[PDB]
Amino acid sequence: QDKATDLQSIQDEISALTDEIDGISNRTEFNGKKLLDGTYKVDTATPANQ
Amino acid sequence: QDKATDLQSIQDEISALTDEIDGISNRTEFNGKKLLDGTYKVDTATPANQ
């Protein structure tokens, strides 16, 4: 029922909320630690970098 | 949780207390005897110098 125009609008909203989620995973610099850096603690199936 | 910066600070403190401990083992010049010279009375597993 909606249009590509309307869904372009919603998609603008979802990119806003998107970079807000990157915002949570980034702004969480606790004592300088980007803890919600997904990189910070990945098991990686190796002890190369955890 | 701490940083290499913070632990550099604590390490400065532990070097201060360190040279304080050398301070105890050195300043104890009783009648001129650095008694807490660890050198002064080592058994050494020999009578070479005790």
Side-chain angles (χ1 to χ4, degrees):
Chain A
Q1 185 176 357
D2 295 333
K3 298 292 186 180
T5 301
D6 295 330
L7 296 172
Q8 184 65 41
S9 66
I10 296 170
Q11 190 270 326
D12 292 331
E13 184 175 359
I14 297 168
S15 67
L17 295 174
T18 300
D19 188 74
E20 183 62 25
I21 296 167
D22 290 329
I24 298 170
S25 66
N26 290 316
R27 290 189 297 271
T28 301
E29 293 180 354
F30 182 75
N31 291 318
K33 291 182 180 178
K34 190 182 285 294
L35 295 173
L36 294 175
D37 191 358
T39 301
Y40 181 76
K41 180 65 174 66
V42 177
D43 293 330
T44 63
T46 186
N49 189 359
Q50 293 179 357
Chain B
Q1 185 176 357
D2 295 333
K3 298 292 186 180
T5 301
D6 295 330
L7 296 172
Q8 184 65 41
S9 66
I10 296 170
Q11 190 270 326
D12 292 331
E13 184 175 359
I14 297 168
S15 67
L17 295 174
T18 300
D19 188 74
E20 183 62 25
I21 296 167
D22 290 329
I24 298 170
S25 66
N26 289 316
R27 290 189 297 271
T28 301
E29 293 180 354
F30 182 75
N31 291 318
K33 291 182 180 178
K34 190 182 285 294
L35 295 173
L36 294 175
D37 191 358
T39 301
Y40 181 76
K41 180 65 174 66
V42 177
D43 293 330
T44 63
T46 186
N49 189 359
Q50 293 179 357

Coordinates of all heavy atoms in Angstrom, one line a residue:
Chain A
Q1 N 0.8 -1.2 0.0 CA 0.0 0.0 0.0 C 0.9 1.3 0.0 O 0.5 2.3 -0.6 CB -0.9 0.0 1.2 CG -1.9 1.2 1.2 CD -2.9 1.1 2.4 OE1 -2.9 0.1 3.1 NE2 -3.7 2.1 2.5
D2 N 2.0 1.2 0.6 CA 2.9 2.4 0.7 C 3.7 2.5 -0.6 O 3.6 1.6 -1.5 CB 3.9 2.2 1.8 CG 3.2 2.3 3.2 OD1 2.1 2.9 3.3 OD2 3.8 1.7 4.1
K3 N 4.4 3.6 -0.8 CA 5.2 3.9 -2.0 C 6.7 3.8 -1.7 O 7.2 3.9 -0.5 CB 4.8 5.3 -2.5 CG 3.4 5.4 -2.9 CD 3.1 4.6 -4.2 CE 1.8 4.8 -4.7 NZ 1.5 4.0 -5.9
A4 N 7.5 3.8 -2.8 CA 8.9 3.9 -2.7 C 9.3 5.2 -2.1 O 10.4 5.3 -1.5 CB 9.6 3.6 -4.0
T5 N 8.5 6.3 -2.3 CA 8.7 7.5 -1.7 C 8.6 7.4 -0.2 O 9.5 7.8 0.6 CB 7.7 8.6 -2.2 OG1 7.9 8.7 -3.7 CG2 7.9 9.9 -1.6
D6 N 7.4 6.9 0.3 CA 7.2 6.7 1.7 C 8.2 5.8 2.3 O 8.7 6.2 3.4 CB 5.8 6.1 1.9 CG 4.7 7.0 1.4 OD1 4.9 8.3 1.5 OD2 3.6 6.5 0.9
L7 N 8.6 4.8 1.7 CA 9.6 3.8 2.3 C 11.0 4.4 2.2 O 11.9 4.0 2.9 CB 9.5 2.5 1.5 CG 8.2 1.8 1.7 CD1 8.2 0.6 0.8 CD2 8.0 1.3 3.1
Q8 N 11.2 5.4 1.3 CA 12.4 6.1 1.3 C 12.5 7.0 2.6 O 13.5 7.1 3.2 CB 12.6 7.0 0.1 CG 13.9 7.7 -0.1 CD 15.1 6.8 -0.2 OE1 15.0 5.8 -0.9 NE2 16.1 7.1 0.5
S9 N 11.3 7.6 2.9 CA 11.2 8.3 4.2 C 11.5 7.4 5.4 O 12.4 7.8 6.2 CB 9.9 9.0 4.3 OG 8.8 8.0 4.4
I10 N 10.8 6.3 5.5 CA 11.0 5.4 6.6 C 12.5 4.9 6.6 O 13.1 4.8 7.7 CB 10.1 4.2 6.5 CG1 8.6 4.6 6.7 CG2 10.4 3.1 7.6 CD1 7.6 3.6 6.4
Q11 N 13.1 4.7 5.4 CA 14.4 4.3 5.4 C 15.4 5.3 5.9 O 16.4 5.0 6.5 CB 14.8 3.9 3.9 CG 16.1 3.2 3.8 CD 17.3 4.1 3.6 OE1 17.2 5.2 2.9 NE2 18.4 3.8 4.2
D12 N 15.1 6.6 5.6 CA 15.9 7.7 6.3 C 15.8 7.6 7.8 O 16.8 7.7 8.5 CB 15.4 9.0 5.8 CG 15.6 9.3 4.3 OD1 16.6 8.7 3.8 OD2 14.8 10.0 3.7
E13 N 14.6 7.2 8.3 CA 14.5 7.1 9.7 C 15.3 5.9 10.2 O 15.9 6.0 11.3 CB 13.0 6.9 10.1 CG 12.7 6.8 11.6 CD 11.2 6.8 11.9 OE1 10.4 6.8 10.9 OE2 10.9 6.6 13.1
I14 N 15.3 4.8 9.4 CA 16.0 3.6 9.9 C 17.5 3.8 9.8 O 18.3 3.1 10.5 CB 15.5 2.4 9.1 CG1 14.0 2.2 9.4 CG2 16.3 1.1 9.5 CD1 13.3 1.2 8.5
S15 N 18.0 4.7 8.9 CA 19.4 5.0 8.9 C 19.8 5.9 10.1 O 20.9 5.8 10.6 CB 19.8 5.6 7.6 OG 19.2 6.9 7.4
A16 N 18.9 6.8 10.4 CA 19.1 7.6 11.6 C 19.2 6.7 12.8 O 20.2 6.7 13.6 CB 17.9 8.6 11.8
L17 N 18.2 5.8 13.1 CA 18.3 4.9 14.2 C 19.5 3.9 14.0 O 20.1 3.5 15.0 CB 17.0 4.1 14.3 CG 15.7 4.9 14.6 CD1 14.5 3.9 14.6 CD2 15.8 5.5 16.0
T18 N 19.9 3.6 12.8 CA 21.0 2.8 12.5 C 22.3 3.4 13.2 O 22.9 2.8 14.0 CB 21.2 2.6 11.0 OG1 20.1 2.0 10.5 CG2 22.5 1.8 10.7
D19 N 22.6 4.6 12.7 CA 23.8 5.3 13.2 C 23.6 5.7 14.7 O 24.6 6.0 15.4 CB 24.1 6.5 12.4 CG 25.5 7.1 12.7 OD1 26.5 6.5 12.4 OD2 25.5 8.2 13.4
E20 N 22.4 5.6 15.2 CA 22.2 5.7 16.7 C 22.7 4.4 17.3 O 23.2 4.4 18.4 CB 20.8 5.9 17.0 CG 20.5 6.0 18.5 CD 21.3 7.2 19.2 OE1 21.6 8.2 18.5 OE2 21.6 7.1 20.4
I21 N 22.5 3.2 16.6 CA 22.9 1.9 17.2 C 24.5 1.8 17.1 O 25.1 1.4 18.1 CB 22.3 0.8 16.5 CG1 20.8 0.8 16.8 CG2 22.8 -0.6 17.1 CD1 19.9 -0.1 15.9
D22 N 25.1 2.2 16.0 CA 26.5 2.4 16.0 C 26.9 3.4 17.0 O 28.0 3.3 17.6 CB 26.9 2.9 14.6 CG 26.8 1.9 13.5 OD1 27.0 0.7 13.8 OD2 26.6 2.3 12.4
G23 N 26.0 4.4 17.3 CA 26.2 5.3 18.4 C 26.3 4.7 19.8 O 27.1 5.1 20.6
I24 N 25.5 3.7 20.0 CA 25.6 3.0 21.3 C 26.9 2.2 21.4 O 27.6 2.2 22.3 CB 24.3 2.1 21.6 CG1 23.1 3.0 21.7 CG2 24.5 1.4 22.9 CD1 21.8 2.2 21.7
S25 N 27.1 1.4 20.3 CA 28.3 0.6 20.3 C 29.6 1.4 20.2 O 30.6 0.8 20.4 CB 28.2 -0.3 19.0 OG 28.3 0.4 17.8
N26 N 29.5 2.7 20.0 CA 30.7 3.5 19.9 C 30.8 4.5 21.1 O 31.9 4.5 21.7 CB 30.7 4.4 18.7 CG 30.9 3.5 17.4 OD1 31.8 2.7 17.4 ND2 30.1 3.8 16.4
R27 N 29.8 5.2 21.5 CA 29.9 6.2 22.5 C 30.2 5.6 23.9 O 30.7 6.4 24.8 CB 28.5 7.0 22.6 CG 28.2 7.9 21.5 CD 27.0 8.7 21.8 NE 25.8 7.9 22.0 CZ 24.9 7.5 21.0 NH1 25.1 7.9 19.8 NH2 23.9 6.8 21.3
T28 N 30.0 4.3 24.1 CA 30.2 3.7 25.3 C 31.7 3.6 25.5 O 32.3 2.5 25.5 CB 29.5 2.3 25.3 OG1 28.1 2.5 25.1 CG2 29.7 1.6 26.7
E29 N 32.4 4.7 25.8 CA 33.8 4.8 26.1 C 34.0 4.9 27.6 O 34.3 6.0 28.1 CB 34.4 5.9 25.3 CG 34.4 5.8 23.8 CD 35.1 6.9 23.1 OE1 35.4 7.9 23.7 OE2 35.2 6.8 21.8
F30 N 33.9 3.8 28.2 CA 34.0 3.7 29.7 C 35.4 3.7 30.1 O 36.1 2.7 29.8 CB 33.2 2.5 30.2 CG 33.2 2.4 31.7 CD1 32.3 3.2 32.4 CD2 33.9 1.4 32.3 CE1 32.3 3.0 33.8 CE2 33.9 1.3 33.7 CZ 33.1 2.1 34.4
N31 N 35.9 4.7 30.8 CA 37.3 4.9 31.1 C 38.1 4.9 29.9 O 39.3 4.4 29.9 CB 37.8 3.8 32.1 CG 37.2 4.0 33.5 OD1 37.1 5.1 34.0 ND2 36.8 2.8 34.1
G32 N 37.6 5.3 28.8 CA 38.2 5.3 27.5 C 38.0 4.0 26.7 O 38.6 3.8 25.6
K33 N 37.3 3.0 27.3 CA 37.1 1.7 26.7 C 35.8 1.7 25.9 O 34.7 1.7 26.4 CB 37.1 0.6 27.7 CG 38.4 0.5 28.3 CD 38.6 -0.6 29.2 CE 40.0 -0.5 29.7 NZ 40.2 -1.5 30.6
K34 N 36.0 1.6 24.6 CA 34.8 1.3 23.7 C 34.5 -0.1 23.9 O 34.8 -1.0 23.2 CB 35.2 1.6 22.3 CG 34.1 1.6 21.3 CD 34.6 1.9 19.9 CE 34.9 3.3 19.6 NZ 33.7 4.2 19.7
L35 N 33.8 -0.4 25.0 CA 33.5 -1.7 25.5 C 32.6 -2.4 24.5 O 32.8 -3.6 24.1 CB 32.9 -1.7 26.9 CG 33.8 -1.2 28.0 CD1 33.0 -1.1 29.2 CD2 35.0 -2.2 28.2
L36 N 31.5 -1.7 24.1 CA 30.6 -2.2 23.0 C 31.2 -2.1 21.6 O 30.5 -2.3 20.7 CB 29.3 -1.6 23.1 CG 28.4 -1.8 24.3 CD1 27.2 -1.0 24.3 CD2 28.0 -3.3 24.5
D37 N 32.5 -1.8 21.5 CA 33.2 -2.2 20.3 C 33.1 -3.7 20.3 O 33.6 -4.5 21.1 CB 34.7 -1.9 20.4 CG 35.4 -2.1 19.1 OD1 34.8 -2.5 18.1 OD2 36.6 -1.8 19.0
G38 N 32.3 -4.2 19.3 CA 32.2 -5.6 19.0 C 33.6 -6.2 18.8 O 33.8 -7.4 19.0
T39 N 34.6 -5.5 18.3 CA 35.9 -6.0 18.1 C 36.6 -6.4 19.4 O 37.4 -7.3 19.5 CB 36.8 -4.9 17.4 OG1 36.2 -4.6 16.1 CG2 38.3 -5.4 17.2
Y40 N 36.3 -5.6 20.5 CA 37.1 -5.7 21.7 C 37.2 -7.1 22.3 O 38.3 -7.5 22.6 CB 36.5 -4.8 22.8 CG 37.4 -4.8 24.0 CD1 38.6 -4.1 24.1 CD2 37.0 -5.5 25.1 CE1 39.4 -4.1 25.2 CE2 37.8 -5.5 26.3 CZ 39.0 -4.8 26.3 OH 39.8 -4.8 27.4
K41 N 36.1 -7.8 22.4 CA 36.1 -9.2 22.9 C 35.3 -10.1 22.0 O 34.1 -10.3 22.2 CB 35.6 -9.2 24.3 CG 35.6 -10.6 25.0 CD 37.0 -11.1 25.2 CE 36.9 -12.4 26.0 NZ 36.2 -13.5 25.3
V42 N 35.9 -10.5 20.9 CA 35.5 -11.6 20.1 C 36.3 -12.8 20.5 O 37.5 -12.7 20.7 CB 35.6 -11.3 18.6 CG1 35.1 -12.5 17.7 CG2 34.7 -10.1 18.3
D43 N 35.6 -14.0 20.6 CA 36.4 -15.2 20.9 C 37.3 -15.6 19.7 O 38.4 -16.0 19.9 CB 35.4 -16.3 21.2 CG 34.7 -16.1 22.5 OD1 35.3 -15.4 23.4 OD2 33.5 -16.5 22.7
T44 N 36.8 -15.4 18.4 CA 37.5 -15.5 17.2 C 37.9 -17.0 16.8 O 38.5 -17.2 15.8 CB 38.8 -14.7 17.2 OG1 39.7 -15.2 18.2 CG2 38.5 -13.2 17.5
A45 N 37.5 -17.9 17.6 CA 38.0 -19.3 17.5 C 39.5 -19.4 17.5 O 40.1 -20.3 16.9 CB 37.4 -19.9 16.2
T46 N 40.2 -18.4 18.1 CA 41.6 -18.4 18.3 C 42.0 -17.5 19.4 O 41.3 -16.5 19.6 CB 42.3 -18.0 16.9 OG1 43.7 -18.2 17.0 CG2 41.9 -16.6 16.5
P47 N 43.2 -17.7 20.0 CA 43.7 -16.7 20.9 C 44.5 -15.6 20.3 O 45.2 -14.8 21.0 CB 44.6 -17.5 21.9 CG 45.0 -18.7 21.1 CD 43.9 -19.0 20.2
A48 N 44.4 -15.5 18.9 CA 45.2 -14.4 18.2 C 44.9 -13.0 18.8 O 45.9 -12.3 19.0 CB 44.9 -14.5 16.7
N49 N 43.7 -12.7 18.9 CA 43.3 -11.4 19.5 C 41.9 -11.4 20.1 O 40.9 -11.4 19.4 CB 43.4 -10.3 18.5 CG 43.3 -8.9 19.0 OD1 43.1 -8.7 20.2 ND2 43.4 -7.9 18.2
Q50 N 41.9 -11.6 21.5 CA 40.6 -11.6 22.2 C 40.5 -10.4 23.2 O 39.5 -9.8 23.3 CB 40.5 -12.9 23.0 CG 40.3 -14.1 22.1 CD 40.2 -15.4 22.9 OE1 40.3 -15.4 24.1 NE2 40.0 -16.5 22.2
Chain B
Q1 N 40.3 -3.2 33.7 CA 39.5 -1.9 33.6 C 40.4 -0.7 33.6 O 40.0 0.3 33.0 CB 38.6 -1.9 34.8 CG 37.6 -0.7 34.8 CD 36.7 -0.8 36.0 OE1 36.7 -1.7 36.8 NE2 35.8 0.2 36.1
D2 N 41.6 -0.8 34.2 CA 42.5 0.4 34.3 C 43.3 0.4 32.9 O 43.2 -0.5 32.1 CB 43.5 0.2 35.4 CG 42.8 0.3 36.8 OD1 41.7 1.0 36.8 OD2 43.3 -0.2 37.7
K3 N 44.0 1.5 32.8 CA 44.8 1.8 31.6 C 46.3 1.7 31.9 O 46.7 1.8 33.0 CB 44.5 3.2 31.0 CG 43.0 3.3 30.6 CD 42.7 2.5 29.4 CE 41.4 2.7 28.9 NZ 41.1 1.9 27.7
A4 N 47.1 1.6 30.8 CA 48.5 1.7 30.9 C 49.0 3.0 31.4 O 50.0 3.2 32.1 CB 49.1 1.4 29.5
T5 N 48.2 4.1 31.1 CA 48.4 5.4 31.8 C 48.2 5.3 33.3 O 49.2 5.6 34.0 CB 47.4 6.4 31.2 OG1 47.6 6.5 29.8 CG2 47.6 7.8 31.8
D6 N 47.1 4.8 33.7 CA 46.8 4.7 35.2 C 47.9 3.8 35.9 O 48.4 4.1 36.9 CB 45.4 4.1 35.4 CG 44.3 5.0 34.9 OD1 44.5 6.3 34.9 OD2 43.3 4.5 34.4
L7 N 48.2 2.7 35.2 CA 49.2 1.8 35.8 C 50.6 2.3 35.7 O 51.4 1.9 36.5 CB 49.1 0.4 35.1 CG 47.7 -0.3 35.3 CD1 47.7 -1.5 34.5 CD2 47.5 -0.7 36.7
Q8 N 50.8 3.2 34.8 CA 52.1 4.0 34.8 C 52.1 4.9 36.0 O 53.2 5.0 36.7 CB 52.2 4.8 33.5 CG 53.5 5.5 33.4 CD 54.7 4.5 33.3 OE1 54.6 3.5 32.7 NE2 55.8 4.9 34.0
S9 N 51.0 5.5 36.4 CA 50.9 6.2 37.6 C 51.2 5.4 38.9 O 52.1 5.7 39.7 CB 49.5 6.9 37.7 OG 48.5 5.9 37.8
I10 N 50.4 4.3 39.0 CA 50.7 3.4 40.1 C 52.1 2.9 40.1 O 52.7 2.8 41.2 CB 49.7 2.2 40.1 CG1 48.2 2.7 40.2 CG2 50.0 1.2 41.2 CD1 47.2 1.6 40.0
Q11 N 52.7 2.6 39.0 CA 54.0 2.2 38.9 C 55.0 3.2 39.4 O 56.0 2.9 40.0 CB 54.4 1.7 37.5 CG 55.7 1.0 37.4 CD 56.9 1.9 37.1 OE1 56.8 2.9 36.5 NE2 58.0 1.6 37.7
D12 N 54.7 4.5 39.1 CA 55.5 5.6 39.7 C 55.4 5.5 41.2 O 56.5 5.6 41.9 CB 55.0 6.9 39.2 CG 55.3 7.1 37.7 OD1 56.3 6.6 37.2 OD2 54.6 7.9 37.1
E13 N 54.2 5.2 41.7 CA 54.1 5.1 43.2 C 54.9 3.9 43.7 O 55.5 4.0 44.8 CB 52.6 4.9 43.6 CG 52.4 4.9 45.1 CD 50.9 4.9 45.4 OE1 50.1 4.9 44.4 OE2 50.5 4.8 46.5
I14 N 54.9 2.8 43.0 CA 55.6 1.6 43.5 C 57.1 1.7 43.3 O 57.9 1.0 44.0 CB 55.1 0.3 42.7 CG1 53.6 0.2 43.0 CG2 55.8 -0.9 43.1 CD1 52.9 -0.9 42.1
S15 N 57.6 2.6 42.4 CA 59.0 2.9 42.4 C 59.4 3.8 43.6 O 60.5 3.7 44.1 CB 59.4 3.5 41.1 OG 58.8 4.7 40.9
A16 N 58.5 4.7 43.9 CA 58.7 5.5 45.1 C 58.9 4.7 46.3 O 59.9 4.7 47.1 CB 57.6 6.5 45.3
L17 N 57.9 3.8 46.6 CA 57.9 2.9 47.7 C 59.1 1.9 47.6 O 59.6 1.5 48.6 CB 56.6 2.1 47.8 CG 55.3 2.9 48.2 CD1 54.1 2.1 48.1 CD2 55.4 3.6 49.5
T18 N 59.5 1.6 46.3 CA 60.6 0.7 46.1 C 61.9 1.4 46.7 O 62.5 0.8 47.6 CB 60.8 0.5 44.6 OG1 59.6 -0.1 44.1 CG2 62.0 -0.3 44.3
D19 N 62.2 2.5 46.2 CA 63.4 3.2 46.7 C 63.3 3.6 48.2 O 64.3 3.9 48.9 CB 63.8 4.4 45.9 CG 65.1 5.0 46.2 OD1 66.1 4.4 45.8 OD2 65.2 6.1 46.8
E20 N 62.0 3.6 48.7 CA 61.9 3.7 50.2 C 62.3 2.4 50.8 O 62.8 2.4 51.9 CB 60.4 4.0 50.5 CG 60.2 4.1 52.0 CD 60.9 5.3 52.6 OE1 61.3 6.2 51.9 OE2 61.2 5.2 53.9
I21 N 62.1 1.2 50.2 CA 62.5 0.0 50.8 C 64.0 -0.2 50.7 O 64.7 -0.6 51.7 CB 61.8 -1.2 50.1 CG1 60.3 -1.1 50.4 CG2 62.3 -2.6 50.7 CD1 59.4 -2.1 49.5
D22 N 64.6 0.1 49.6 CA 66.1 0.3 49.5 C 66.5 1.4 50.6 O 67.6 1.3 51.2 CB 66.5 0.8 48.2 CG 66.4 -0.3 47.1 OD1 66.5 -1.5 47.5 OD2 66.1 0.1 45.9
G23 N 65.6 2.3 50.8 CA 65.8 3.3 51.9 C 65.9 2.7 53.3 O 66.7 3.1 54.1
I24 N 65.1 1.7 53.6 CA 65.2 1.0 54.9 C 66.4 0.2 54.9 O 67.2 0.2 55.9 CB 63.9 0.2 55.2 CG1 62.7 1.1 55.2 CG2 64.1 -0.5 56.5 CD1 61.4 0.4 55.3
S25 N 66.6 -0.6 53.9 CA 67.8 -1.5 53.9 C 69.1 -0.7 53.8 O 70.2 -1.3 54.0 CB 67.7 -2.4 52.7 OG 67.8 -1.7 51.5
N26 N 69.1 0.6 53.6 CA 70.3 1.4 53.5 C 70.4 2.4 54.6 O 71.5 2.5 55.3 CB 70.3 2.3 52.2 CG 70.5 1.4 51.0 OD1 71.4 0.5 51.0 ND2 69.7 1.6 49.9
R27 N 69.4 3.2 55.0 CA 69.5 4.2 56.0 C 69.8 3.7 57.4 O 70.3 4.4 58.2 CB 68.2 5.0 56.1 CG 67.9 5.9 54.9 CD 66.7 6.8 55.2 NE 65.5 6.0 55.5 CZ 64.6 5.6 54.5 NH1 64.8 6.0 53.2 NH2 63.5 4.9 54.8
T28 N 69.6 2.4 57.6 CA 69.8 1.7 58.9 C 71.3 1.6 59.1 O 71.9 0.5 59.0 CB 69.1 0.4 58.9 OG1 67.7 0.6 58.7 CG2 69.3 -0.3 60.3
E29 N 72.0 2.7 59.3 CA 73.4 2.8 59.6 C 73.6 2.9 61.1 O 73.9 4.0 61.6 CB 74.1 3.9 58.8 CG 74.1 3.7 57.3 CD 74.7 4.8 56.5 OE1 75.1 5.8 57.2 OE2 74.9 4.7 55.3
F30 N 73.5 1.8 61.8 CA 73.6 1.8 63.2 C 75.0 1.7 63.7 O 75.7 0.7 63.4 CB 72.8 0.6 63.8 CG 72.7 0.5 65.3 CD1 71.9 1.3 66.0 CD2 73.5 -0.4 65.9 CE1 71.9 1.3 67.3 CE2 73.4 -0.5 67.3 CZ 72.6 0.3 68.0
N31 N 75.5 2.8 64.3 CA 76.9 2.9 64.6 C 77.8 2.9 63.4 O 78.9 2.4 63.4 CB 77.4 1.9 65.6 CG 76.8 2.1 67.0 OD1 76.7 3.2 67.5 ND2 76.4 1.0 67.7
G32 N 77.2 3.3 62.3 CA 77.9 3.2 61.0 C 77.6 1.9 60.3 O 78.2 1.7 59.2
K33 N 76.9 1.0 60.9 CA 76.7 -0.3 60.3 C 75.4 -0.3 59.5 O 74.3 -0.3 60.0 CB 76.6 -1.4 61.3 CG 78.0 -1.6 61.9 CD 78.1 -2.6 62.9 CE 79.5 -2.6 63.3 NZ 79.7 -3.5 64.3
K34 N 75.5 -0.5 58.2 CA 74.4 -0.7 57.3 C 74.0 -2.2 57.6 O 74.3 -3.1 56.8 CB 74.8 -0.5 55.9 CG 73.6 -0.5 54.9 CD 74.1 -0.3 53.5 CE 74.5 1.2 53.2 NZ 73.3 2.1 53.2
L35 N 73.3 -2.4 58.7 CA 73.0 -3.7 59.1 C 72.0 -4.4 58.2 O 72.2 -5.6 57.8 CB 72.4 -3.7 60.5 CG 73.3 -3.2 61.6 CD1 72.5 -3.0 62.9 CD2 74.5 -4.1 61.9
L36 N 71.0 -3.7 57.7 CA 70.1 -4.3 56.7 C 70.7 -4.2 55.3 O 70.0 -4.3 54.3 CB 68.8 -3.5 56.8 CG 67.9 -3.8 58.0 CD1 66.7 -2.9 57.9 CD2 67.5 -5.2 58.2
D37 N 72.0 -3.9 55.2 CA 72.7 -4.4 54.0 C 72.5 -5.9 54.0 O 73.0 -6.6 54.8 CB 74.2 -4.0 54.1 CG 74.9 -4.3 52.8 OD1 74.2 -4.7 51.8 OD2 76.1 -4.0 52.7
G38 N 71.7 -6.3 53.0 CA 71.6 -7.7 52.7 C 73.0 -8.4 52.5 O 73.2 -9.6 52.8
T39 N 74.0 -7.6 52.1 CA 75.3 -8.2 51.9 C 76.0 -8.6 53.2 O 76.7 -9.5 53.3 CB 76.2 -7.2 51.2 OG1 75.7 -6.8 49.9 CG2 77.7 -7.7 51.0
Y40 N 75.7 -7.8 54.3 CA 76.5 -7.8 55.5 C 76.6 -9.2 56.1 O 77.7 -9.7 56.4 CB 75.9 -6.9 56.5 CG 76.8 -6.9 57.8 CD1 78.0 -6.2 57.8 CD2 76.4 -7.6 58.9 CE1 78.8 -6.2 58.9 CE2 77.2 -7.6 60.0 CZ 78.4 -6.9 60.0 OH 79.2 -6.9 61.1
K41 N 75.5 -9.9 56.2 CA 75.5 -11.3 56.8 C 74.6 -12.2 55.9 O 73.4 -12.4 56.1 CB 75.0 -11.3 58.2 CG 74.9 -12.6 58.9 CD 76.3 -13.2 59.1 CE 76.2 -14.5 59.9 NZ 75.5 -15.6 59.2
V42 N 75.3 -12.7 54.8 CA 74.7 -13.8 54.0 C 75.6 -15.0 54.4 O 76.8 -14.9 54.6 CB 74.9 -13.5 52.5 CG1 74.4 -14.7 51.7 CG2 74.0 -12.3 52.1
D43 N 74.9 -16.2 54.5 CA 75.6 -17.4 54.8 C 76.5 -17.8 53.7 O 77.6 -18.2 53.9 CB 74.6 -18.5 55.2 CG 73.9 -18.2 56.5 OD1 74.5 -17.5 57.4 OD2 72.7 -18.6 56.7
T44 N 76.0 -17.7 52.4 CA 76.7 -17.8 51.2 C 77.1 -19.3 50.8 O 77.7 -19.5 49.8 CB 78.1 -17.0 51.2 OG1 78.9 -17.5 52.2 CG2 77.8 -15.5 51.4
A45 N 76.7 -20.2 51.7 CA 77.1 -21.6 51.6 C 78.6 -21.7 51.6 O 79.2 -22.6 51.0 CB 76.6 -22.2 50.3
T46 N 79.3 -20.7 52.2 CA 80.8 -20.8 52.3 C 81.2 -19.8 53.4 O 80.5 -18.8 53.6 CB 81.4 -20.4 51.0 OG1 82.9 -20.6 51.1 CG2 81.1 -19.0 50.5
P47 N 82.3 -20.0 54.1 CA 82.9 -19.0 55.0 C 83.7 -17.9 54.3 O 84.4 -17.2 55.0 CB 83.8 -19.8 55.9 CG 84.2 -21.0 55.1 CD 83.0 -21.3 54.3
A48 N 83.7 -17.8 52.9 CA 84.4 -16.8 52.2 C 84.2 -15.4 52.7 O 85.1 -14.7 52.9 CB 84.1 -16.9 50.7
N49 N 82.9 -15.0 52.9 CA 82.6 -13.7 53.4 C 81.2 -13.7 54.0 O 80.2 -13.7 53.3 CB 82.7 -12.7 52.3 CG 82.6 -11.3 52.9 OD1 82.5 -11.0 54.1 ND2 82.7 -10.3 52.0
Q50 N 81.2 -13.8 55.4 CA 79.9 -13.8 56.1 C 79.8 -12.6 57.1 O 78.8 -12.0 57.2 CB 79.8 -15.1 56.9 CG 79.5 -16.3 56.1 CD 79.4 -17.6 56.9 OE1 79.5 -17.5 58.1 NE2 79.1 -18.7 56.2

